[PDB]
Amino acid sequence: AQSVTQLGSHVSVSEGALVLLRCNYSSSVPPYLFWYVQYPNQGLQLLLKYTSAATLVKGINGFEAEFKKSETSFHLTKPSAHMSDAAEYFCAVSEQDDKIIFGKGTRLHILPNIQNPDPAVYQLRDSKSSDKSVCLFTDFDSQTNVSQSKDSDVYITDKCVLDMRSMDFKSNSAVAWSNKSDFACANAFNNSIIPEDTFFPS
């Protein structure tokens, strides 16, 4: 096998929806094919592989992939996306009868199903002081995305999903902060399109 193509370095799926990560290969003779997963902080784990036996290969955790010679594909699927499926996935191919070659990888982002959004911007104070604080934009659904800062002395993080197991409760948040004198939480996310009913305490 000359090559392997995964398209989209980052992809999204709704929590509970079908997972589909695409892989295509270039190789006139059918190759052996592999899907590895990588959790943040970790190494590589084999999910499944095509080794010229079953065409529908079944892997750990409900993962499966079908080798389709006529469309040179080996797409990875799982029937329902869980928050714990958040990881980078790599498809891979045998080559030159002596090695495995790797796709560039796709990160799967799972958009939590947020039935009751409660968008809000809160101010948090340093536990010592040094009367510093940060601003926390939280509890918006996945129609909101957070834009990067256009003031170089204000820092804004990407949104991040946490899953509180204690209450079976997931939520989005981004953090903003600055040492600037005229920085206020009211203005911190002005460069993002926020929900019209964002709570600004009080």
Place this chain on the structure above:
Amino acid sequence: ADVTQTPRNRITKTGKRIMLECSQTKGHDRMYWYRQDPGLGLRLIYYSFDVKDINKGEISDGYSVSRQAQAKFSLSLESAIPNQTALYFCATSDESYGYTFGSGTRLTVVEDLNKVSPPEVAVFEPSEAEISHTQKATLVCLATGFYPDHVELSWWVNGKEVHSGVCTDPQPLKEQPALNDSRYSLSSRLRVSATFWQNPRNHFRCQVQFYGLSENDEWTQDRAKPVTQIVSAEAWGRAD
């Protein structure tokens, strides 16, 4: 094939020869060194089918290897440069593509060790307005002013490590993005019920493991030598 690699983490200055070592117990003929970079996957550097056989992969420039035993396959950066900063993975294979990967080597090449700097870490307490509105409480950890981008952040409640309720930025941001040696910043959140935050018996700590200088490195500055170390910050629960 307990495949083992050493070291696990290393920071080095540019212009140094650096050695990474892979060992296996299963005696597989076939061993491989790969590097992983964001957006590029795992790219093959070199590989070996016996003690007499070495073969280039796609990115062999800047590197050399030695297969000094059935069990051992060494990788060298000849003269380290910053773009060799990466996670490095060795692997073995059997005769039918059964691959075993080692757990990885995180290597950072820096141009100037004088810029190394541990983080300052602060915990920010939950807001009253959050607690009132949601009956939940979000703590924020901020690690700032660190260099290189080579940390691990974790949260510790009453002395034990927690994963639930946590989100940590997947990559740090640059404090001064127009500089090639900008310091970094990273944030994390830990959300608990208001009731748990409200209990003054509960203790919350953000721990940042920093990788920097070793005892062997020369240090000529007045400020603290920026050695590998843990920096934490803490808060207690508050009846209010």
